[PDB]
Design a binder for this molecule. Structure first.
Ligand SMILES: Cc1c[nH]c2ncnc(NCC3(O)CCCCC3)c12
Ligand SMILES: [Cl-]
Length: 167
């Protein structure tokens, strides 16, 4: 039993809700919140900008130190950093950016990072400002993630479509 509320069950381990991941984070304080990161951990907009703003830019400050030490992430890769006031940990995961010509096949690799954590609050990777179809992202998620994932989908019409077209 966990504290996630009002999620529609899609499969054994995947749950979905029309919600702002920032608000789900502020209310639940999960062990892991997933950020839809880019390779530079530049949290300017989208999920990343929203999470970072909610941390009063502390996420960006921590991220800049991480990059200065370690260099950029790989597309499809991840790192674990602090969750600040939102979660215990933030798993920064880089899905491919279709607008940059990045290989959509890397979306599966991106979702594989979730399997290192028993329970996560997450967005649909590569969707939104990253350019991919959220329907496709959801299918890759369901077919790749084996741990318990709670998805917050920001857009109501897209959520309804994600729900309606699933089975
Ligand atoms: C921008 C933003 C702020 N707070 C959020 N919480 C969740 N998702 C977000 N954007 C990505 C997505 O949900 C958009 C609809 C289709 C699936 C992907 C955001
Ligand atoms: Cl977005």
């Amino acid at each position: 039993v966990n504290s996630f509320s009002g999620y529609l069950k899609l499969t054994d381990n995947v749950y979905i809700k029309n919600a702002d991941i920032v608000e789900e984070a502020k209310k639940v304080k999960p062990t892991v919140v997933v950020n839809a990161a880019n390779v530079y951990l530049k949290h300017g907009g989208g999920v990343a900008g929203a999470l970072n703003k909610a941390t009063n830019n502390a996420m960006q400050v921590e991220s800049d130190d991480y990059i200065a030490t370690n260099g950029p992430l790989k597309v499809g890769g991840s790192c674990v950093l602090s969750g600040h006031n939102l979660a215990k940990h933030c798993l920064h995961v880089v899905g491919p950016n279709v607008n940059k010509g990045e290989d959509i096949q890397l979306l599966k690799s991106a979702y594989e990072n979730f399997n290192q954590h028993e329970v996560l609050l997450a967005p649909l990777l590569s969707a939104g400002i990253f350019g991919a179809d959220p329907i496709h992202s959801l299918r890759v998620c369901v077919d790749t993630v084996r741990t318990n994932v709670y998805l917050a989908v920001f857009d109501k019409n897209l959520y309804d479509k994600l729900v309606s077209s699933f089975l």
